[PDB]
Design an enzyme around this catalytic site. Structure first.
Site, PDB file in Angstrom:
ATOM      1  N   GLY A  61       0.792  -1.215   0.000  1.00  0.00           N
ATOM      2  CA  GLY A  61       0.000   0.000   0.000  1.00  0.00           C
ATOM      3  C   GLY A  61       0.827   1.269   0.000  1.00  0.00           C
ATOM      4  N   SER A  90       5.105  -5.566  -2.365  1.00  0.00           N
ATOM      5  CA  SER A  90       5.451  -4.176  -2.287  1.00  0.00           C
ATOM      6  C   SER A  90       5.862  -3.745  -0.898  1.00  0.00           C
ATOM      7  CB  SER A  90       4.266  -3.394  -2.823  1.00  0.00           C
ATOM      8  OG  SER A  90       4.543  -2.041  -2.993  1.00  0.00           O
ATOM      9  N   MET A  91       5.206  -2.753  -0.333  1.00  0.00           N
ATOM     10  CA  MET A  91       5.537  -2.272   1.012  1.00  0.00           C
ATOM     11  C   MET A  91       5.435  -3.389   2.041  1.00  0.00           C
ATOM     12  SD  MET A  91       6.753   0.650   0.885  1.00  0.00           S
ATOM     13  CE  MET A  91       7.122   0.600   2.629  1.00  0.00           C
ATOM     14  N   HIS A 115       8.480  -4.374  -6.190  1.00  0.00           N
ATOM     15  CA  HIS A 115       8.361  -3.558  -7.391  1.00  0.00           C
ATOM     16  C   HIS A 115       8.512  -2.092  -7.010  1.00  0.00           C
ATOM     17  CE1 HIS A 115       3.691  -2.613  -7.346  1.00  0.00           C
ATOM     18  NE2 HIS A 115       4.287  -2.272  -6.218  1.00  0.00           N
ATOM     19  N   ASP A 164       7.002  -5.870 -11.775  1.00  0.00           N
ATOM     20  CA  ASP A 164       6.605  -6.805 -10.724  1.00  0.00           C
ATOM     21  C   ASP A 164       7.535  -8.017 -10.692  1.00  0.00           C
ATOM     22  OD1 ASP A 164       4.569  -5.113 -10.039  1.00  0.00           O
ATOM     23  OD2 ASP A 164       2.934  -6.488 -10.543  1.00  0.00           O
TER      24      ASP A 164
END
Lengths: 186, 187, 184, 186, 188, 187, 187, 188, 186, 187
Positions: A61, A90-91, A115, A164
């Site tokens: 997010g 991600s995060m 990513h 990604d």
């Protein structure tokens, strides 16, 4: 619909929090970050020397929100073990990789993905230049954090996160994002 | 409208005290998290006592279903699975993943297996990446199914190409469950 | 507004007296909560009657069969009582009550009919779904024939369209055992 | 849509004057009716002169596409078919149904064939009826394609189980067209 | 899905539990209702003990000027010293509030971000009404630059130039600017 | 997200125990009723102890605002008013209506006064009736403000013709408050 | 509001009489069909006279763009392309596909080339089919651009990985056009 | 509700009728489709006579940069001299087009308004894509300032400073700035 | 639904335009202004010495659009007579008052209204200050135009337009906005 | 679906050639403008020949209806009015405003008169201004009605307080029309 337990009445997540377990199981925004930060600070205040377990099943997010979780993990004295069940993207993958070294785990079919960040800008050219510079700083910072916690050269991380970049649990172990793939309990 | 028992329990919380978990919805991340939480809690209370997972679900997200699957394999407590109603797709994988010998179906319950469903948007480069992930998931789910049913992988790959429905008795013959239970004295 | 009792909401209070309500259209979540109540009551005492009050237009086949199968599974005898309406899957559940303990209020009604569904997709996918619904149609006719004592061929003809029965007509059909007007 | 003088024509009406019809949209009853009307009109003007049907369509309703197919076979005038762009599903059937020897593709045009799709809601009895109609349609379309391509029926049935895409050269090899045309010299 | 704690009988949600330890969260965009609930917690904690520190954790993009100033004024109003900690982001009115914490007790986590900029608004109506609304915004703009200059030690002319557009600061840059007193990395 | 205090109080309920009421939203009938209810409750608990009314509101419906106004005048307990943030229109009338000597503002709080706004549709007869009511409300509010500020009625009527914004110090000069407070010892 | 000329022409129809076609919108099947129809009409009117294709388009559907591309190559009439404004993706392919020596840009016009974008939902089998098609389209478009620009295929594939914007002079260096024209005598 | 004229047989709407007198209207926000139809009229009129003046009446708030530049380039491209007249408003790309008319033949009605300012846009996507889009906007911003400096005779640094925010000019001020050559009040 | 006349086929408004009659019968935006400007320029080019009649029934509208109409009326050599039928408010009242002196008319129950301009601004304080200055300049300009064409002192016009200022036809005559109230035709 | 005659007329344009105008919709500014345009055109063609205005309308905006009313009084051509169906509110004013002696109704046509309807939003000052305008319009319409019917003003003011429906014969007795026409030979 979330069930309850007694002994004192607890919902299941509050009951696990009593055992120093926190769930990061949603996309990450400020509110999710604030409640995770609150639980980390609470557990560390109760006992700064006992392990905290952060279970992760999240697509990631907002960068600032994820970094508030990251910074609080580094800040508290209590060691934070991370376990990805399901997905850490991600995060959320940064947070997984930020667990106490030696105590970052994945279930066998869990998935990790890293990513570069995503964003948007609207405004005059002057405002766009300002915002584009912030996203470019965030992109560099996240690659530096990932490199630091995986031991990978920054140049490699920057290449891998251009699109990604999906990892199986075993591949994430080889990358340096986790320390152990766990299949069965002792 | 969820009823209560008396210190105060809703009916699902009351059954959780008896080591019973319900998987009765489509599966997303939030459903997987709460089922994983219940499995870990029950296993922490007693790693030697059976857990019963009642299943009535059309399946759902692959990653979410695999989190339930992995947690079932992880915990020491044996997880018995019982399909009431329907166990389709990821819910059929979870059903077949219960403790061998303790996988049950009611007589008119239905099981269905099929390849995963997905979506992709983006540039050709991004689509190729997402397509690879769907393809790996399809292979992995067929492998997990072959592993828990004893069917050869090629047969599973063929049966799951389209929606493959099984009655309880057919699911028994397929190797997805161990027993069709009709009456309680029979246990 | 659902009122409360102190010794419970009114339904939880009646569950303490081994009473369950099936009073909504049937989907998976309704089936799950009724199944949960049946299993709970049967574990409390497998020898005492459970009473299932029914006022439902029916609903999903798989969900209705989960209730039906759990009624047959538990050792506790499940008495069924239609107040209002018992249509389609709910009429199947009514007829599946313990024989001799299936009841109707005088103006309650029962309706039986073949299943309803939908399918979208390619011809291959439609063929698969059409055969599942056709298997469901046959099975529900067989279950109704079993619990009413009617010949299967008659049940198949009667459920081709919506088939409404008064309480007295449902008694004659074999879907219930007694019309109760007064308590006594 | 632009206009032409010498009494004014839109460009499509102007091309109809030269016995050219466009099938350039998804196919529904309405599209089929106006294409049929044009075929009947041109054939009544001259039953011996070629008609050109340019095709750039993703296909559409089976009954509508078969009305075009049948009218092409019905009229005495030979109907040449040319795919520019794409000819998918019912539009690929129509392409393949042009006068033998006069079915053409531009070099980068695409053809796709696949089994029919549909839906129905209702009682089991009503669903059984509709599934039977889709199954007859599927068999009929495979038989028409086998007929006009020269491929064995079993092969066509296997190929159309999922979306089956062909380049112009592959469509020539399949028997769906007679020639890939690149430039206006022959 | 906010978890609970029991008698750490007494049942607290996690934020009520931290409030017991004199911790307040400003973790959302700022409107009147957010300002009121933060003001209420400040008044409550100060009445329980006017001499003990209060900790205000900040993760907010800012918001309405009047609402942010109600928080600002209440911080100065209460006798209890209010320490501010930006976790995540403190933008706009939230950066004003961050900088307004007790001097020496304004903190940032290492990757937190601070941003300052002139106010934004809108108005529709007659020219007479628009002139009135434009004058209020221009007074707000000047007041916020003055408050920032006061708590950072920066010259007013510098602050006015820097806030003309979005002015982002890392934690270390915010320390050098004077918006915080210390970047904290580990507990101790 | 409203925090709790311990038995169970939310933070506003906890402050109500200390005779503090918040008027922190736009004013409609429901807001006025709950503020009236709190004033009556505190006054019945003790008719001699101060009540503190914290104000942060853009105003709202005239009838609702006047119900708060009337109840403040009615109760024997003295009601101190404190604007934190903003007090516009009916909220400014309510601020100025606090106990003489106990009307306060924080340093950057703002007050705004203006004539009432409304609307009506209907026949000419119905419109004439509604216009006279808004006309009476406009005059009445100017009279109430003149009374509690000590300003001449013609000045209030000229000032409220359009939005009339005042800083805390300017509201002090107007007579809408009695003191600008920076630190809490001042109360 | 499209003006008219005299018998009755709208301005685009009037320019079509002078063998001028506009590609001035995003490209879908309907846009491609009408451009194809105009090309065939002009080529049938005279297969030896130049056609002018004015381009101001962000591109669009691949199949539609290739139908325009193929028809330009097919007709005997030479098609000059002139980008006014922008020519992105399929519109840039079409620009570069004009008759060699007769591909033009106005001085501030812009060209952009990039790989194709799409989407698909469905089963893993269906997704695999659609990903291979977008993969073939991506390769084919790089091959067409390499052919008409004279650039090596590996360079085109690297350049179109993300949005690759070129000024008129830079598009000239790339080989996408033959001349930047400032005044009309240059044509 | 656009009226018609007959053979001034031949039927014209009012704009087609004025086009017969070599008059073009740019009276809407500018997008690709507006630019294309204005370019088409310019090409048509210039082909009918490359030596006769064309009159472009302007009443537009501007619009897309690429579309406005297509009009700008076509004005320079055609041999026919294009006179520009702002009636009402010529903002942004419309002010660029106004200033680009034939030197000596750029006009304004007395109460017309001109406004110039830097471009505006938006982008969503990955950081890589955003950097690409930000670079295009910054090139557009510099190019538009250069074009304005060229047609006004103003120093580039002055134009860049003036367009940082919305820069409104009356007709007389636009003449003094160099965006037009004459304010015309009455016909003669 | 607008009817037609012959002698050549005209819609009713085009037919009246042939008699040098223009209708301003809608709220005023750029498009309305452009078409009115176009007709004024056309009629003046056909004959710069013959009267043009502008019938007005409009609530007004955008200031810039209304001023383009105003400026074109002053620009063309042809005298423009104005007649309010129904309503002339705001920018439409300015246009009414801008007719050739001596040739500004009202029907007996027509209504005129003048008022200051209305607007909106969104943005940073810097942008708001810029836009507020433009609306304040527009307000002054419209009062100056009204004063010039009515002969009223600017100070009075500025006072009268502070809120909606309604005039009957006879009151508008006394104000100087029109020259004659017309009841019956010669 | 408006039919045609043959050079080409829609049916309303064909009747306009015979000096017949239809007012057959609710009245807004656009309807008034086109009716005014037709009245002025017909009067310019011949100021001495009758115009017939057929009415079937529920009324509408006052200013728009008064524009039709004033133009009828202005033109030299006598305007005969005929209600077919219904003439309510402003349409009843226009009906009653036809040339005296030439105001007609079909036998089952209906007439209705009533005071105007409106709306106001804004500050009290703005509402007072708009309320004044509604009030003047109400008085003016009652005055116009008294003038064309010959009824005393006070009676009209009373009859129009609420919806006041008249049959054709009652409208004749009221003075709103001059003749109820049943058959064509009777004219």
């Amino acid at each position: 619909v979330i069930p309850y337990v007694i002994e004192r009445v607890y919902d299941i997540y509050s009951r696990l929090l009593k055992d120093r377990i926190i769930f990061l199981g949603t996309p990450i925004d400020a509110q999710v970050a604030n409640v995770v930060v609150a639980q980390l600070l609470f557990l560390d205040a109760q006992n700064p020397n006992q392990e905290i377990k952060l279970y992760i099943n999240s697509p990631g997010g907002e960068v600032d929100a994820g970094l508030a979780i990251y910074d609080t993990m580094q800040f508290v004295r209590a060691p934070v073990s991370t376990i990805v069940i399901g997905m850490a993207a991600s995060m959320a993958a940064v947070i997984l990789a930020a667990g106490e070294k030696g105590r970052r785990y994945a279930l066998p079919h869990a998935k990790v993905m890293i990513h570069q960040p995503w964003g948007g800008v609207r405004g005059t050219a002057s405002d766009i230049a300002i915002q584009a510079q912030e996203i470019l700083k965030a992109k560099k910072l996240l690659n530096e954090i990932l490199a630091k916690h995986t031991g990978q050269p920054l140049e490699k991380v920057e290449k891998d996160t251009d699109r990604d970049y999906y990892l199986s649990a075993q591949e994430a172990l080889e990358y340096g994002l986790i320390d152990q793939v766990v299949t069965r309990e002792e």
